[PDB]
Design an enzyme around this catalytic site. Structure first.
Site, PDB file in Angstrom:
ATOM      1  N   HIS A  72      -7.005  -6.575  -0.104  1.00  0.00           N
ATOM      2  CA  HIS A  72      -5.851  -5.708   0.079  1.00  0.00           C
ATOM      3  C   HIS A  72      -4.842  -6.297   1.064  1.00  0.00           C
ATOM      4  O   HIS A  72      -3.656  -5.965   0.995  1.00  0.00           O
ATOM      5  CB  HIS A  72      -6.307  -4.332   0.549  1.00  0.00           C
ATOM      6  CG  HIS A  72      -5.241  -3.284   0.484  1.00  0.00           C
ATOM      7  ND1 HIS A  72      -4.557  -2.986  -0.675  1.00  0.00           N
ATOM      8  CD2 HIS A  72      -4.737  -2.465   1.440  1.00  0.00           C
ATOM      9  CE1 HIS A  72      -3.687  -2.020  -0.435  1.00  0.00           C
ATOM     10  NE2 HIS A  72      -3.771  -1.691   0.842  1.00  0.00           N
ATOM     11  N   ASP A 111      -8.813  -6.718  -4.470  1.00  0.00           N
ATOM     12  CA  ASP A 111      -8.521  -5.545  -3.657  1.00  0.00           C
ATOM     13  C   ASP A 111      -9.603  -4.495  -3.866  1.00  0.00           C
ATOM     14  O   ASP A 111      -9.946  -4.165  -5.001  1.00  0.00           O
ATOM     15  CB  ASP A 111      -7.148  -4.997  -4.051  1.00  0.00           C
ATOM     16  CG  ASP A 111      -6.552  -4.039  -3.027  1.00  0.00           C
ATOM     17  OD1 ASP A 111      -7.314  -3.322  -2.344  1.00  0.00           O
ATOM     18  OD2 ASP A 111      -5.297  -3.983  -2.945  1.00  0.00           O
ATOM     19  N   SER A 145       0.857  -1.204   0.000  1.00  0.00           N
ATOM     20  CA  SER A 145       0.000   0.000   0.000  1.00  0.00           C
ATOM     21  C   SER A 145       0.887   1.246   0.000  1.00  0.00           C
ATOM     22  O   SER A 145       1.785   1.348  -0.849  1.00  0.00           O
ATOM     23  CB  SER A 145      -0.963  -0.114   1.174  1.00  0.00           C
ATOM     24  OG  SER A 145      -1.723   1.070   1.328  1.00  0.00           O
TER      25      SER A 145
END
Ligand SMILES: [Mg+2]
Ligand SMILES: [Mg+2]
Length: 250
Positions: free
Chosen positions: A227, A199, A79
């Site tokens: 995710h 995701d 991320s």
């Protein structure tokens, strides 16, 4: 062969999000370091003391600077962690065997350093943040992020178990998204992207967009991954990382 994996968490998370993957890499013979960035996990700092992404990355830079001669690491960023990778790769590129971008922000060298974040912001309707709390603080005006339980449950952990979501609810902490990544430094490292297809935080389409924008040396696809692939697809993820370790070395 055997590598040194340096695992870099994303926004509002900490070293703890790698707690299932690290033992797997270690059973494969690798050395594994899972940092807390500043004001993350159990780091004692609070977000109000951080002014820049560079300062947020301090523990990563500190650790890389301490690395003895000859020691090379494979960075793994999740991320927002991908931006920490770009910061680290531009200061210690001689120490990085490769960087892996796990459903992460992959910056480039042709656009300004924040380009992928700005574009991510522009494609993301504010409704998607659900109960995420945005506040402002001052240092020396900075917007803080704090994921709420709905956002965690519905946009990050939706394919994870209840113990995974509860763990994050128990640990997440305020974070913040806060000039050019160099071709000679960041631009020179081998990069690998791991796409997480289910995701909902960083949609696959954005992930594909970043690959289109700045093609890496290898792209893996993790089917059924939300995710937090390191929590729901830990075994498959460790198998990709072994392939990476075998490819990028001597
Ligand atoms: Mg931690
Ligand atoms: Mg769940």
């Amino acid at each position: 062969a055997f590598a040194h994996f340096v695992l870099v968490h994303g926004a509002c998370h900490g070293g703890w999000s790698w707690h299932k993957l690290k033992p797997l890499l270690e059973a494969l013979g690798h050395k594994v370091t899972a940092l807390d960035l500043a004001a993350s996990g159990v780091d004692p700092r609070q977000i109000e003391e951080l002014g820049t992404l560079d300062e947020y990355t301090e523990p990563l830079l500190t650790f890389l600077e301490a690395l003895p001669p000859g020691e090379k690491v494979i960075l793994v960023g999740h991320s927002l962690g991908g931006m920490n990778l770009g910061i680290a790769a531009d200061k210690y590129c001689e120490k990085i065997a490769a960087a892996v971008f796990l459903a992460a922000f992959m910056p480039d060298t042709e656009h300004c350093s924040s380009f992928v974040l700005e574009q991510y912001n522009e494609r993301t309707p504010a409704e998607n943040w659900l109960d995420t709390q945005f506040l402002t603080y001052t240092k020396d005006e900075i917007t803080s992020m704090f994921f709420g339980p709905k956002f965690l449950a519905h946009k990050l952990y939706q394919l994870c178990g209840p113990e995974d979501l509860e763990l994050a609810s128990m640990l997440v902490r305020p974070s913040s998204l806060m000039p050019f990544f160099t071709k000679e430094g960041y631009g020179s490292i081998k990069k690998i992207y791991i796409v997480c297809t289910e995701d909902k935080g960083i949609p696959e389409e954005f992930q594909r967009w970043q690959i289109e924008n700045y093609k890496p040396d290898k792209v893996y696809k993790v089917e059924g991954a939300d995710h937090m692939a390191m929590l729901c697809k830990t075994k498959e993820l460790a198998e990709i990382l072994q392939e990476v370790a075998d490819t990028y070395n001597a």
